[PDB]
Design a protein around this ligand. Sequence first.
Ligand SMILES: Cc1cn([C@H]2C[C@H](O)[C@@H](COP(=O)(O)OP(=O)(O)OP(=O)(O)O)O2)c(=O)[nH]c1=O
Ligand SMILES: Cc1cn([C@H]2C[C@H](O)[C@@H](COP(=O)(O)OP(=O)(O)OP(=O)(O)O)O2)c(=O)[nH]c1=O
Ligand SMILES: [Mg+2]
Ligand SMILES: [Mg+2]
Lengths: 640, 640, 7, 7
Amino acid sequence: TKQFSKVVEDLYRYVNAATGKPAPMISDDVYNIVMENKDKLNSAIVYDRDFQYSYFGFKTLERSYLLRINGQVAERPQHLIMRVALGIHGRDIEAALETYNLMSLKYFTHASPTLFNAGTPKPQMSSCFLVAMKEDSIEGIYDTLKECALISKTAGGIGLHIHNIRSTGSYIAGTNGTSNGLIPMIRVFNNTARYVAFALYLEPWHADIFDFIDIRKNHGKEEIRARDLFPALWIPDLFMKRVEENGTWTLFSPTSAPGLSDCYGDEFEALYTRYEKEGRGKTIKAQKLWYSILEAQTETGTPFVVYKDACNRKSNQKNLGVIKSSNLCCEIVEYSAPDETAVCNLASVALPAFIETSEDGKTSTYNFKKLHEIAKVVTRNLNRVIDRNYYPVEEARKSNMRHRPIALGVQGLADTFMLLRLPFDSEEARLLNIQIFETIYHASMEASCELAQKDGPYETFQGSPASQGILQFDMWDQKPYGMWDWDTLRKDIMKHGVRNSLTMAPMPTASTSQILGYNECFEPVTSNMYSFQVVNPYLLRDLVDLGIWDEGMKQYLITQNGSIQGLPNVPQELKDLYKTVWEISQKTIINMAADRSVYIDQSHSLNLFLRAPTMGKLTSMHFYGWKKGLKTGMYYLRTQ
Amino acid sequence: TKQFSKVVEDLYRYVNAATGKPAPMISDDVYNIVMENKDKLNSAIVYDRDFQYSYFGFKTLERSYLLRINGQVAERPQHLIMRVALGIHGRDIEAALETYNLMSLKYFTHASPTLFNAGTPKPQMSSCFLVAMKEDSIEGIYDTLKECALISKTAGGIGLHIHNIRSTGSYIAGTNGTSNGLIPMIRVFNNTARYVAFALYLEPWHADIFDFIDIRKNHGKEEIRARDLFPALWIPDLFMKRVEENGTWTLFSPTSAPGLSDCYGDEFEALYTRYEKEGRGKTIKAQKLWYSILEAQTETGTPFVVYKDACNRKSNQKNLGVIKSSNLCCEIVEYSAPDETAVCNLASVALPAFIETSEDGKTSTYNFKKLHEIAKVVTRNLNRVIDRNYYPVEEARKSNMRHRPIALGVQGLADTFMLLRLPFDSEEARLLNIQIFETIYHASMEASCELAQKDGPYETFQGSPASQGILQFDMWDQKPYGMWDWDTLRKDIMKHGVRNSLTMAPMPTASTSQILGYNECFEPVTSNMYSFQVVNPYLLRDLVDLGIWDEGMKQYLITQNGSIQGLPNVPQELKDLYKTVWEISQKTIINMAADRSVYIDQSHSLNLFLRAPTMGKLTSMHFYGWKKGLKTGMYYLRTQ
Amino acid sequence: FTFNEDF
Amino acid sequence: FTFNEDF
Ligand SMILES: Cc1cn([C@H]2C[C@H](O)[C@@H](COP(=O)(O)OP(=O)(O)OP(=O)(O)O)O2)c(=O)[nH]c1=O
Ligand SMILES: Cc1cn([C@H]2C[C@H](O)[C@@H](COP(=O)(O)OP(=O)(O)OP(=O)(O)O)O2)c(=O)[nH]c1=O
Ligand SMILES: [Mg+2]
Ligand SMILES: [Mg+2]
């Protein structure tokens, strides 16, 4: 239509012809805003920026993001972006226009649900939810089920923790019967998910643990499986110790050993230890469970591994109570309770947008000042999203409004390293990683402090680590790299507060990185060849600058896993620079994750890749991340 | 232990050793009653009556009814009976002692759940529940699901009606998606039933009807089935007309044709007809659906057939609103709503207990006066049960307390006919059937009127048919057979009310008839041979009185379907008297069901038996019951 | 379809 | 089980 206000007209007046029901695609609110500002809004759009995408990147928007009329695309990309900008900012036209420009130029983007839903009548802009199992009763299980069903009407993922449901064989008052345990109850939630993804969180001392970790096994032992949901372990340090030292581990039903999931560290160890001596559970060899874990991971990629004590000891939300899960993708570490369902408010900064080639020659630099700036903008966007969001359930509204947690992420890390000619595993990639995550943390906390000065600190700020001057890297007992002035930031925080309980959680970017044409989040390249036929564009240009690219190359690069090691007409500096993730030591991956993590409020989704997997390599890879103090030891195990 | 008060002591003080939790088997209430009356109670028991059972009848009590300690029977049958008597009557010791004697002598019994649960701490004495689907929304579906889960913690069946859930393809506001329809939602309830029987009720104009009636088909078209639940049709007369006259039938989604399940008879016809002309649905040939129905029944025995208009036009509960289902077994016709879940309060009168052989010779008579009397006792028991019952959900408490419906049944009809030497199909069996059901209706309504004089009429009595002098047989436009004075009864009812909205619903007796050694309810014998090796005892004695019984008979009777037609050394009077249900015309079965039904408040479970089934026989058998004014046209189709 | 038969 | 390896 080439006129934003007109496509807003069409989308707003849309009527479902099949039924005769008016089916508005835009909220009253955002429609009134567009009309009262139609000239400023319409002439702000730079339609030239629609060509600033790729083919497969534009096709991702076209296939799934751009609003449609009669199955016909009704929005151009600039319209979608301006819709999202207004959906976020409402009446703040100048804030909207800035977000429009920065997003359209590709400095950052917002998570899928924001892009779908910003500026529509039910604007559910948040990626995921962390649900507490409400109580160990039919009532609690079915109240929780209803809530998960309600959450799934507008979709976005669910992380659900079930440490409190009594295991198989457990006694039930007023009946001859005993509990069926977890698996049967998991099958109820699976079925609801199917009717209307799910991650399930459990502590490894739970007596149904062996069955739980095989939830995704292929060999179908009938009604003891549930493929559809993802198991995630919530691992206490004691577990890992016992495995390392080859000792024992005791399985309990939470009704015979209550409170285990309501404490952590030493208080857990003491309470767990007392329960073991009172013969309340069933003892086995720690390594028997360990073995079963790694078999499940080797075969299914699951369960995920997130360290409970690391999460809780190093969370600014520790004044709230004990955090009992993470989320679907293993980056969110936010408190939940029967009446508080934690929400993920996500957006990603495009890291390559800050590469500048300044003062002639091959020299490119990285603009940390512009990064600091854009991270400040996204932090403010994300706060606007807390408030303007549609909450599918009241538990989620209560959680978000009370603690106001935010999750800033990144995309194009690998892209950034490659454009700057840095091998992922170099000392220069290692330093740039630290600096980026430092500036993003400093900027988000600075912007959040500004917000606290304007609107007050979040309700639960007092008594929090941040209020006592304890920032994230402090909880790792480190000094910050020191590109930014932390003293002054910390001073202002203790004086004024921050608006957000939490700020950082580098997530799986997935389809929001496909649109901008960057590699997923903070990962390296899985292949120098994706899909059709597309080779790594940075690699492709280097092979064309040596004049060696042709068809006697496209074949090779295909039937060779997208790898370039072992190509004879290829300089060593190129091999170093375009290692596949299978070709990078996972020790380097974990080291670099440990570096950035001192600057991460929450966690981050650490996918791990093992070429020639053995139970010994996996065990070592796990204990390495664990001794590194990682919160998320592992998202998916990818293999072979 | 031979001492009731002592076994009450043991059961009350029971402790679950595995857990250390005190697990009382008796309520505080009933325990205090036993102790304060221990001498009267203990010396009332006649332990000689434990031998007044059969082997397989005692074994039914032993296997499943008698309370147990460490998996060891802790109650003798007289203890169980005295427990039930006290559970029903509480402080009314003289009422308890009467029920004790009458039950122990085997004049009547109570439904399974009463026998299990009477006098225990959660005394859930009611057989089944009729649940309304609360609303066409995720909220309503999941509130309904929770309620069904709650009901299943203490078991007893569920009849659930789902006429209000929108069908496959139906529009949903705020989404690109359309509804999955009924089958997927049925699979959610199936799974809950499995986790924690179910009958499902639907009107045949619902657009998912074809899939609904095949819910139990063997050939497993994956996730479109749900074997576990029973489909039951709620058939409007218009449907049957259209099939008979070979015309059309229109399928609607209740959102495009709302209110159809909230009217009946002519008002339905008018509203259905208007919707058909407004082109709101999809027209097909009535006989296409009909055909599909009979294929499903022939193959699975389901769906059940209950006539909506017959049920509603002839219900004393019609002042409440429109009745939208029956129950699991197809005898209950009671109103339900989102906040009122109808309850089945069941007990069966043992019909053979009234056969008397008076003034020498072969002459036995039937004591209708003693029948009238015992029916009066059971009516009062059943009212005590309304009040002393534990309700698993509030919807059910509200329903029972407000309208106080009761369901008296029978067992040993066939037994009665055979002991009196009457062929099931004789004019004398036809008259005795009418007389029995007349006296039971007269007695229950008389006792209920007495109760209304003592405690007031039920809350919804005014504006009801009964309050305008319209009794059940009146609604069939018949004169009562007239063994009892109806004028005087009707007069007292209009003056004083009745305590119960409803009184009669001859049900499947099942395991409560196995204990007393009688044939199921109002059915004839399926075989003259059950199970081991037991021949019909009345048949067995007649073959021994001709001296022909041996092993060259036990073989025959086994490999011959338990039939005696086509045995040469067997008199014609015997063949007539011991016809198998396969050998009795189903026309006679339906005629006799139509006779008693003028005296039935609710409905009765009419199982039908077809020897050499054809689509034509089944169609005829259906239309015959339908033109007979039957409420329940068919419970299960048994075949072959 | 046949309505009126011996069953 | 072996904790300390080349991965
Ligand atoms: C009723 C029921 C419960 N359960 C599980 C669900 C919960 O995890 C647990 C408790 O159910 P509850 O509904 O809490 O049962 P209850 O109230 O009788 O509790 P208690 O035993 O303490 O007296 O048992 C089943 O697995 N199957 C069942 O049929
Ligand atoms: C959300 C959802 C609903 N349904 C069904 C359940 C109900 O029968 C029906 C309505 O769901 P509702 O929860 O009532 O959806 P809604 O509030 O958006 O209602 P409406 O369309 O009128 O605006 O759709 C599905 O089958 N699958 C789904 O994912
Ligand atoms: Mg409980
Ligand atoms: Mg709705």
